[PDB]
Design a protein around this ligand. Structure first.
Ligand SMILES: O=P(O)(O)O[C@H]1[C@H](OP(=O)(O)O)[C@@H](OP(=O)(O)O)[C@H](OP(=O)(O)O)[C@@H](OP(=O)(O)O)[C@H]1OP(=O)(O)O
Lengths: 536, 501
DNA sequence: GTTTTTAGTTTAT
DNA sequence: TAATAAACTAAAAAC
C-alpha cells in the first residue's frame, strides 16, 4: 500500500570528517538516500518522500519562529519523488558547516508527516535518520517525541557510520558495502556513545527488544533492502482447502515466499529520429517452406501438430473439446513419505509456496498445526496435487513442515513428472583409474577449503556465523540499472558510467577470505597442471 | 545430427518362456520396452532414427537375403503407424501374431545378423552421428556348439567397434543367471570404463529393462561448457547439464490448408511512412517515466547487464547446513568436468568433490551463464555416485548447481499468533499420516496434460477408434483412502472442529 | 548452419 | 479490479 517517508539527513560539519580509507558519512548517507529514491522513482510507486536536512548553514523550516530549531532545512516537502530530487542529491546538496540537534530535526520531520499527510491515504508513516551522532543534543524532548510517534503511529529507523556491535580490524581493510568491516568501533568518540544510547532507548520504546535491529550502518545499508523494509507492499493470499480424502477439509491460505523479481519496465523499440513507437511496424509473412517460396494468405492456414514423422492437423476448436480438463482449484494430499525420499535436486517450478491456515480461523489453525507437527515428529513429508485454478495445469509437489518460534506453516515446492527426467549416464569419478588425485593434491584442496571458509563457529557452541550471506544482498542488476537510467536523464551527452565499487564490494567475499587463500591457491597452481586442448 | 539406434530382438524358444516368473516373457518384455522408447522419442520431439530387427525367425527379410533375419522396420523416424505395428506383438495375443507372421526358434548366425544391422546404417539418406545396436536376448552362449559361427561373430563384432558402431547388450533373465563372460564379453562396446567391468545386471522386470535402455536411449547433451575459475590463473572447464527439464506441450505448427504442408514464417521490420527495411542501427530503445523519455542504444541496454564474463567464479566454501531447503528459486543443474577443453580439470574436480564431501561443504560461486547477463550466486553441492541393485546410476557423481536467491527474490507474509495443537490432536493426525504412507519415487507420476495431448494425436493420425480419456494419476484415490482411514476422520474432527463450525 | 533453452514480452482467464 | 500462469517471441550457444 501507499506510504509517506521523510528522509532526515545530517549534513553537519562532522559528517565530512571520516577515517582515512573509508568515505565520509556525508558521502555514505548520500548514496544510501540515492539508492532509496532511485528505486522509488524508477519503480513508479505512489509513495511520497520528503527530505529534511539538519546541519546546514541556513535555516528554513516551519518551526524556526523564535530562534528555535536552527540549521534545519526542509529541502523537499511531501510529494512524489522525481528526477529533480535525484539531481539535487547528486549535485546541488552540499555539506554544511554547522551542527544541529538531531532530535530537533526529528521533530521537524514529524511535523511534515503530521501537517502534510492531512487528507491523503497513507497506510504507513516512516522517518529515516542519517547521522553520525557526533554533536550534542537536548534530551528534554525525549518523552515528547515518543508520545507523538506512538499516537501518530510513525515507525523509525537509524543509519550510522558504524555498526551496533564492534570492529576487530584496527586502522585494517575498509571498503564501502563490504562484508566484515564497517568503521572501527575504537574510532568513535564519547559523544557518539551518548547519542547511540539515546538511539537505543528510543527504538526500544517504539519497537521493543527488536528495536535494536533497526539500527544500521551506511556500509551495510548499501548491500541490504533495509531502507525499504517499512514500506514494502503486502503479499496476496491464495484461498483454498487442504483435503485428505473426501471427508477431511482444512481451510488454508498460501503465499509465495520465493519468487524472482527481475526487471519491471520494458524497453520499447522506437525510431532513431522521431523517438516514437508508431514509426515502427513488423509484418510476418508466410510461404511454402519446401520448393518454390509461394506466399500463403491467412485464409489458407490451419493449425497442426507433429507426432514423430507424422503431421496431424488439429484446429484450436477441436483442441478445446478434446483438451484435458480438471475439476479446478485444489490442494489434495496423495500420501505421505519419508523426507529422505525427496531430494532437493528434484525441485521444480519457479516459486516456493508457504501454506498457512485461513486467517482468523482457529479451528483450521489447530487442524493444520496437527499436520505440521505430525510430519515433523515422524520426519515425513506430504505429496500433494496442486492446481492454481481451473485453467492452470495440475502439478505434483511436496509439502514439508516449517516450524518457527512465531509461526508454523507448510512449504510447497513442485515435484517433477516422469516426462521431465533425463537419465544421462556419467562416468565414475570415485572409481577412477585416470583422474584420482594424489595425497599432496588432496591436502592442497583440503587446505584451500579451510582457508576459503565462509562460516565462523564463534563462542564454541556449534553456532555458525555466516560470513557471506548472499540471500541478504540485493540483486545488483536493479541499482545498476537505476544508476544508468538516472545518468542518461541527467547527462544525455555522456556515455554510461561504470559499475559502482560498493556494488563490487558486496558481490565479493570478505577481504580476509580472499587474502587467506593466496598461499593455498599457489600450491594448487603447481600441483594441478592445467592446459587447453587444441587439436581436434 | 541424427543418432541411429537399431533394436535387435532374439526370437529363440527361450524368449517366449516365462521361466518361473511373476512377470512377462523376455520377448514381451522387449516388445513393450521398444514401444516405450518409440513413444518417449515422440513426447520429446526427438529426431533420432529407430529400427526393429528380429533374428532366429523362420522367415527372413533383408537386402542380402540372409536367412533367419527379419527387418521389421528400417532406420526411420518413429510414427503412429510404426508404434501401432509394434503393438501387434504385445502380450499373449501378440506372441501368436509374431510366430504366425515370421516363425520362431530357428537357427541363426550372429555374424549374418550384425551384417544386416550395419547395412541399415549405410542405407541412411540423412547424416548420422552415433550408430548403436541394442540386443535383447536371454541366451548367454548362442554358439557354444558351433565354433565356426562364434568366431565369425567375434570378428564381425570387432569390425563394428572399428567402424564406429556401438553394441549394447540388454541381457534378460536366464535360469541360473546370465553369464556375460561366456561369450558377450568380447562383443559389447566399452572403453570408457575404468577397468571396473561393472555393467548392468540381468533384467527380470520390465521396469529394469526400461531404465537400462533409457540410460542409453539418449546421449549426453551439455547445456553449456563454462569456465570454473578458482582465481584468474587456475581455471578448469566444466559442463552444465539439466537432468530435470519441464517437458511442455509442443507448440502448434502452421500448415497449408489444401495440402497440410508446413509453412515457413519470416518476420521483418519496416518504417511505417516510407516502408523501407529497418536496420538495427536505424532504431533505438526507449523507456518513459512520468513525462520524461530515456533513450539508450541497443548496445547500452546490454552493457548495463554486463558484470562478469561467462563462467563460475569461486567465492568460497560454505557448510551445507547454511543452505536452506525452502530457499528454492529455479530448477537446479548438474556440473561435470569437461576434460576435452582444459586437460587436468577432472583431477582438480575430483579432489574438490572428495574434500567437499568429507567436510560437508558447498562451493559458493558467482554464476554467469551467457554473455551480458547479471550474476547470480550458486552453491555447488557435492554429490556422490549412487548405484542401485541393477547397477543403474540413480545419482551421478558431481556437483548440484543450486541457485541462491537475492534479497529481492524473498517475499514476506503477515505473521499469525501461532496456534498450536494439543498432543491428543497431533496423535490422531500421526495415525492418519501413518495410514496413508507410501514409497515416493521421482518417476511415479505422469503429466495428465501431456498424456492426453498425444492420445488425441494418435486417434487423429491413425483414424481408428475415438479418443479415450486418460486416467488422471494425480487425483487422489478417494474411496481407497476413506476405507484406509476408517473412523480416523470422524476422530480428530471431534478434537478440533466444534459442532458450530 | 540447425536445434534446444531461456530471458523477455504478450495476452487472456 | 489486478494476479498470474499458459502462450509466445526472440536471441544465445551447443552440435
Ligand atoms: O540469520 P539466518 O540464519 O540467515 O536466519 C534467517 C533470517 O533471520 P534472522 O536474521 O532474523 O535470524 C531471515 O531474515 P530476513 O531474510 O527476513 O532478513 C529469516 O526470514 P524471515 O524474516 O522470513 O523469517 C529466515 O527465516 P525463514 O527463511 O524461515 O523465513 C531465517 O532463517 P531460519 O528460519 O533458518 O532461522
Amino acid at each position: 500500500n501507499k506510504a509517506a517517508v521523510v528522509l532526515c539527513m545530517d549534513v553537519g560539519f562532522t559528517m565530512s570528517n571520516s577515517i582515512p580509507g573509508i568515505e565520509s558519512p556525508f558521502e555514505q548517507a548520500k548514496k544510501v538516500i540515492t539508492m532509496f529514491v532511485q528505486r522509488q522513482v524508477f519503480a513508479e510507486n505512489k509513495d511520497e518522500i520528503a527530505l529534511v536536512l539538519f546541519g546546514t548553514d541556513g535555516t528554513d523550516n516551519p518551526l524556526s519562529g523564535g530562534d528555535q530549531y536552527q540549521n534545519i532545512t526542509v529541502h523537499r516537502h511531501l510529494m512524489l519523488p522525481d528526477f529533480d530530487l535525484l539531481e539535487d542529491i547528486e549535485s546541488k546538496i552540499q555539506p554544511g558547516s554547522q551542527q544541529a540537534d538531531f532530535l530537533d530535526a526529528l521533530i521537524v520531520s514529524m511535523d511534515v508527516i503530521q501537517h502534510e499527510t492531512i487528507g491523503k491515504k497513507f497506510e504507513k508513516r516512516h522517518i529515516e535518520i542519517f547521522t553520525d551522532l557526533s554533536s550534542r543534543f537536548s534530551k528534554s524532548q525525549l518523552d515528547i517525541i515518543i508520545h507523538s510517534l506512538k499516537k501518530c503511529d510513525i515507525s523509525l529507523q537509524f543509519f550510522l557510520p558504524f555498526s551496533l556491535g564492534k570492529e576487530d580490524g584496527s586502522g585494517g581493510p575498509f571498503r564501502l558495502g563490504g562484508h566484515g568491516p564497517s568503521f572501527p568501533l575504537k574510532g568513535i568518540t564519547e559523544q557518539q556513545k551518548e547519542g547511540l544510547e539515546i538511539v537505543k532507548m528510543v527504538m526500544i520504546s517504539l519497537e521493543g527488544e527488536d528495536g535494536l535491529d533497526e539500527i544500521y550502518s551506511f556500509s551495510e545499508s548499501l548491500r541490504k533492502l533495509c531502507v525499504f523494509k517499512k514500506i514494502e507492499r503486502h503479499s496476496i493470499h491464495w484461498p483454498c482447502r487442504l483435503t485428505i480424502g473426501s471427508n477431511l477439509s482444512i481451510r488454508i491460505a498460501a503465499y509465495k515466499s520465493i519468487l524472482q523479481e527481475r526487471v519491471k519496465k520494458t524497453w520499447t523499440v522506437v525510431d532513431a529520429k522521431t523517438l516514437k513507437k508508431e514509426d515502427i511496424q513488423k509484418e510476418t509473412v508466410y510461404c511454402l517452406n519446401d520448393d518454390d517460396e509461394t506466399e500463403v494468405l491467412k485464409e489458407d492456414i490451419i493449425q497442426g501438430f507433429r507426432y514423430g514423422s507424422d503431421i496431424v492437423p488439429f484446429s484450436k476448436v477441436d483442441e478445446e473439446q478434446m483438451k484435458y480438463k480438471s475439476e479446478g482449484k485444489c490442494f489434495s494430499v496423495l500420501g505421505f513419505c519419508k523426507s529422505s525420499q525427496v531430494q532437493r535436486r528434484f525441485f521444480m517450478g519457479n516459486q516456493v509456496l508457504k501454506v498457512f491456515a485461513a486467517r482468523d480461523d482457529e479451528a483450521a489453525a489447530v487442524a493444520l498445526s496437527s499436520l505440521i507437527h505430525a510430519l515433523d515428529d515422524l520426519d515425513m513429508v506430504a505429496i500433494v496435487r496442486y492446481a492454481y485454478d481451473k485453467r492452470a495445469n495440475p502439478q505434483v509437489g511436496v509439502a514439508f513442515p516449517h516450524i518457527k518460534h512465531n509461526y508454523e506453516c507448510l512449504v510447497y515446492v513442485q515435484l517433477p513428472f516422469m516426462e521431465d527426467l533425463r537419465q544421462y549416464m556419467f562416468s565414475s569419478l570415485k572409481n577412477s583409474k585416470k583422474y584420482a588425485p594424489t595425497e599432496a593434491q588432496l591436502n592442497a584442496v583440503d587446505a584451500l577449503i579451510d582457508s576459503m571458509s565462509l562460516a565462523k563457529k564463534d563462542e564454541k557452541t556449534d553456532t555458525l556465523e555466516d560470513l557471506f550471506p548472499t540471500t541478504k544482498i540485493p540483486n545488483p542488476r536493479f541499482q545498476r540499472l537505476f544508476q544508468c537510467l538516472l545518468h542518461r536523464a541527467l547527462h544525455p551527452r555522456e556515455p554510461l558510467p561504470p559499475i559502482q565499487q560498493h556494488i563490487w564490494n558486496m558481490l565479493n567475499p570478505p577481504a580476509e577470505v580472499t587474502t587467506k587463500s593466496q598461499i593455498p591457491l599457489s600450491k594448487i597452481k603447481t600441483l594441478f597442471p592445467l592446459i587447453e586442448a587444441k587439436k581436434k | 545430427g541424427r543418432d541411429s539406434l537399431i533394436f535387435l530382438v532374439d526370437a529363440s524358444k527361450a524368449m517366449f518362456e516365462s521361466q518361473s516368473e511373476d512377470e512377462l516373457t523376455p520377448f514381451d518384455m522387449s516388445i513393450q520396452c521398444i514401444q516405450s522408447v518409440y513413444i518417449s522419442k515422440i513426447i520429446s520431439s526427438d529426431r533420432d532414427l529407430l529400427a526393429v530387427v528380429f533374428y532366429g525367425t523362420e522367415k527372413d527379410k533383408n537386402s542380402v537375403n540372409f536367412k533367419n533375419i527379419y527387418v521389421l522396420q528400417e532406420l526411420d523416424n518413429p510414427g503412429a503407424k510404426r508404434i501401432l505395428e509394434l503393438d501387434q506383438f504385445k502380450g499373449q495375443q501378440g506372441q501368436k501374431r509374431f510366430q504366425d507372421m515370421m516363425g520362431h526358434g530357428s537357427d541363426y548366425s550372429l555374424s549374418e545378423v550384425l551384417w544386416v544391422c550395419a547395412n541399415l546404417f549405410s542405407d541412411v539418406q540423412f547424416k548420422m552421428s552415433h550408430k548403436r545396436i541394442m540386443l535383447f536376448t536371454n541366451e548367454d552362449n548362442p554358439h557354444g556348439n558351433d565354433s565356426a559361427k562364434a568366431s565369425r561373430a567375434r570378428t564381425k563384432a570387432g569390425d563394428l567397434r572399428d567402424t564406429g558402431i556401438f553394441l549394447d547388450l540388454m541381457h534378460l533373465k536366464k535360469p541360473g543367471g546370465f553369464d556375460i563372460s561366456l561369450f558377450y564379453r568380447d562383443i559389447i562396446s566399452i572403453a570408457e570404463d575404468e577397468d571396473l567391468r561393472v555393467h548392468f545386471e540381468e533384467s527380470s522386470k520390465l521396469e529394469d529393462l526400461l531404465r537400462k535402455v533409457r540410460a542409453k536411449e539418449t546421449r549426453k547433451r551439455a547445456l553449456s561448457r563454462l569456465k570454473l575459475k578458482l582465481n584468474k590463473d587456475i581455471v578448469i572447464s566444466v559442463g552444465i547439464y539439466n537432468l530435470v527439464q519441464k517437458a511442455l506441450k509442443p507448440p502448434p505448427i502452421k500448415l497449408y490448408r489444401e495440402t497440410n504442408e508446413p509453412v515457413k514464417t519470416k518476420t521483418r521490420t519496416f518504417n511505417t511512412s516510407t516502408g523501407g527495411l529497418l536496420l538495427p542501427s536505424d532504431t533505438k530503445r526507449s523507456q518513459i517515466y512520468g513525462s520524461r523519455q530515456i533513450i539508450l542504444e541497443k548496445e547500452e541496454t546490454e552493457e548495463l547487464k554486463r558484470f562478469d564474463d561467462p563462467g563460475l567464479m569461486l567465492m568460497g566454501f560454505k557448510p551445507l547446513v547454511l543452505l536452506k531447503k525452502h530457499h528454492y528459486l529455479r530448477p537446479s543443474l548438474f556440473v561435470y568436468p569437461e576434460e576435452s577443453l582444459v586437460i587436468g580439470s577432472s583431477t582438480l574436480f575430483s579432489a574438490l568433490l572428495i574434500k567437499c564431501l568429507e567436510k560437508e561443504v558447498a562451493a559458493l560461486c558467482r554464476y554467469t551463464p551467457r554473455r551480458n547477463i547479471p550474476p547470480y550466486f550458486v552453491a555447488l553441492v557435492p554429490q556422490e555416485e549412487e548405484l542401485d541393485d541393477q547397477k543403474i546410476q540413480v545419482t551421478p557423481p558431481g556437483f548440484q548447481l543450486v541457485f541462491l536467491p537475492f534479497a529481492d527474490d524473498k517475499r514476506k507474509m503477515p505473521f499469525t499468533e501461532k496456534i498450536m495443537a494439543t498432543p491428543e490432536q497431533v496423535g490422531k493426525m500421526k495415525a492418519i499420516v501413518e495410514k496413508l504412507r507410501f514409497t515416493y519415487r521421482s518417476d511415479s507420476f505422469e503429466n495428465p496434460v501431456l498424456q492426453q495431448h498425444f492420445r488425441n494425436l494418435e486417434a487423429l493420425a491413425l483414424d481408428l477408434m475415438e479418443p479415450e480419456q486418460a486416467v488422471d494419476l494425480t487425483l487422489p484415490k478417494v474411496e481407497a483412502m476413506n476405507k484406509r482411514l476408517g473412523s480416523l476422520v470422524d476422530e480428530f474432527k471431534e478434537l478440533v472442529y466444534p459442532p458450530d463450525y
